[PDB]
Amino acid sequence: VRTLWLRDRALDLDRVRLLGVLNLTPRALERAREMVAEGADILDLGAESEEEKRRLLPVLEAVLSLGVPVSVDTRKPEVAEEALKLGAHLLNDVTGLRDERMVALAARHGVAAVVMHMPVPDPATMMAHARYRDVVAEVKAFLEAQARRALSAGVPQVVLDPGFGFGKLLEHNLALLRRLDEIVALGHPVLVGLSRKRTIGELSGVEDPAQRVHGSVAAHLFAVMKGVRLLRVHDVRAHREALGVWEALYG
Amino acid sequence: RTLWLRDRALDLDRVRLLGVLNLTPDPERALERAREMVAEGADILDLGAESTPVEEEKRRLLPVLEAVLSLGVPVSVDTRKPEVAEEALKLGAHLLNDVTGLRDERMVALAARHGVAAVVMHMPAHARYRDVVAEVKAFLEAQARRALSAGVPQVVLDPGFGFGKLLEHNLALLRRLDEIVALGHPVLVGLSRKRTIGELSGVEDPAQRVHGSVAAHLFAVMKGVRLLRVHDVRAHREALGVWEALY
Ligand SMILES: Nc1nc2ncc(COP(=O)(O)OP(=O)(O)O)nc2c(=O)[nH]1
Ligand SMILES: Nc1nc2ncc(COP(=O)(O)OP(=O)(O)O)nc2c(=O)[nH]1
């Protein structure tokens, strides 16, 4: 019944959908072609960590020719503007649409936006702000506030993401994971991204970030069991395979 | 709850892994493989020498079994022949894994004589059932009672995924796995690399079915299963680290 707006079409959330990550930070149309072949539903491109335009736009234009929905991971409006101008289908804002300029672009271009949580919009100081009295309550309050605001300003739809690994201690990431159902209960499609994250390395005992697929799949299946229908992942094939089994069983 | 392993007990407060060591073509590198699986977190080693082919050729199992037992890790012997089990049990085996479901009174007697737990797996092959779940449950229960009444200290039930079962049958059992767990005995399952996983995940090569296998096993864990028969021990160890911390 639930769907995700992608600028010119609606994507069914009757089954879990995957946002395959394409990181352009220090042609990738080929990596994009592979991810689609592997089952990615949306391609998430980001040159975040202008020089951002130089790295992102050229690739964005090439990948868009595949006809698959493209999400742009950027916090700078000047980038979003140009990304949507070329045809981006989804705006992924790690700073949670704090910037009105971002809200405006979304509503103007008629594109949904992902509101992710960060205690503070500054990546360099977020870890100094992981001191929530009640992390689940506070994240829900922030998400719901950014959502109502964005929706009233003309944003077609908003996807909520608790932002795992952003200004959060393991204790906080765990609490949010275990009570993820409470975020889904807010009524908006929920997106999570635990691929490669420190939380996974900590719980699975894997120090190398590129070797965390089994723990990430496990965390993601748990999230799916909690009602999440959108996953931001690196190993697209691993999740398509796992979901092929999980969705046939849990349902 | 706990699982009796001949001279020690294993708590099932967390999922336990039975690492598979296949000693069939369809030597010494095997011990190295066992040590690796132990290093990766395997709680028990399941050694088998007959695809599921002749009793005399115990040269397959015994030599390896003796060497592996020197690692101190509990060993499960996957054999359906009393002669093999007997020799395996006298050497120190800790668990009797019988795919023919303890139908042979001789294996029941031996298990009881050596005071060793036995795995009762279901296997009819002809994949036709009026009601596979009801039928598999009735078989597992009946055999478990036959075994306990004979002195077997404990019995582990296993629905035998893939054994004389089509996809529909394996799916039904998985979806109602809680009903098998509800029989009061520890439950073991093994879907690693099996056809069911290939069918659901769309993976042609059995050797590349780890992701689908882990997903199936986590579902089983959610249903109450605390014993898994796997090939990729590390993958399961990592996935369970996350899963058990969250669930
Ligand atoms: N909506 C959303 N966007 C995100 N962007 C970057 C990262 C962190 O990923 P990272 O370690 O930087 O690796 P990569 O960007 O290559 O995926 N996580 C999220 C997330 O969790 N949710
Ligand atoms: N208790 C128990 N024993 C078993 N022995 C062999 C197989 C079939 O596994 P297979 O694909 O042949 O691989 P391997 O026997 O090498 O482990 N499955 C089971 C099972 O599911 N449960």
Side-chain angles (χ1 to χ4, degrees), chain B residues 173-191:
Chain B
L173 285 164
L174 271 166
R175 289 169 180 160
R176 292 172 59 186
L177 201 48
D178 50 299
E179 293 176 33
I180 293 181
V181 165
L183 292 180
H185 305 279
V187 176
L188 164 73
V189 306
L191 286 84

Side-chain angles (χ1 to χ4, degrees), chain B residues 104-243:
Chain B
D104 184 356
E105 292 177 53
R106 293 173 300 179
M107 300 216 94
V108 173
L110 262 178
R113 295 211 294 287
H114 290 61
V116 170
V119 172
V120 171
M121 190 191 85
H122 171 281
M123 170 183 210
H126 290 307
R128 304 179 188 299
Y129 302 89
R130 297 190 297 87
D131 185 312
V132 68
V133 178
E135 293 177 53
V136 166
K137 291 203 304 190
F139 175 78
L140 291 176
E141 187 62 294
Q143 296 307 110
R145 276 159 184 156
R146 187 190 310 295
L148 291 178
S149 290
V152 178
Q154 181 177 49
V155 175
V156 177
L157 305 185
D158 184 339
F161 290 102
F163 290 84
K165 299 169 184 79
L166 303 177
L167 179 55
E168 54 198 286
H169 301 136
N170 295 302
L171 282 177
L173 285 164
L174 271 166
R175 289 169 180 160
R176 292 172 59 186
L177 201 48
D178 50 299
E179 293 176 33
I180 293 181
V181 165
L183 292 180
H185 305 279
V187 176
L188 164 73
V189 306
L191 286 84
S192 285
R193 301 179 172 177
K194 296 197 179 172
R195 186 191 301 213
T196 295
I197 303 302
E199 299 169 309
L200 299 181
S201 67
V203 180
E204 189 174 351
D205 184 353
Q208 303 191 292
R209 295 171 180 170
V210 68
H211 293 120
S213 294
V214 167
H217 286 153
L218 292 178
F219 182 89
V221 169
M222 181 177 82
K223 285 290 184 165
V225 179
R226 294 285 172 282
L227 292 168
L228 309 171
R229 185 171 179 281
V230 310
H231 279 85
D232 195 323
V233 176
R234 175 173 138 175
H236 283 78
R237 192 76 290 169
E238 299 178 4
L240 286 167
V242 170
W243 191 267

Side-chain angles (χ1 to χ4, degrees), chain A residues 221 224-225 242-251, chain B residues 215 218-219 222 243:
Chain A
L221 290 184
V224 170
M225 181 180 86
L243 288 168
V245 172
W246 191 268
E247 291 183 298
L249 287 186
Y250 202 93
Chain B
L218 292 178
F219 182 89
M222 181 177 82
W243 191 267

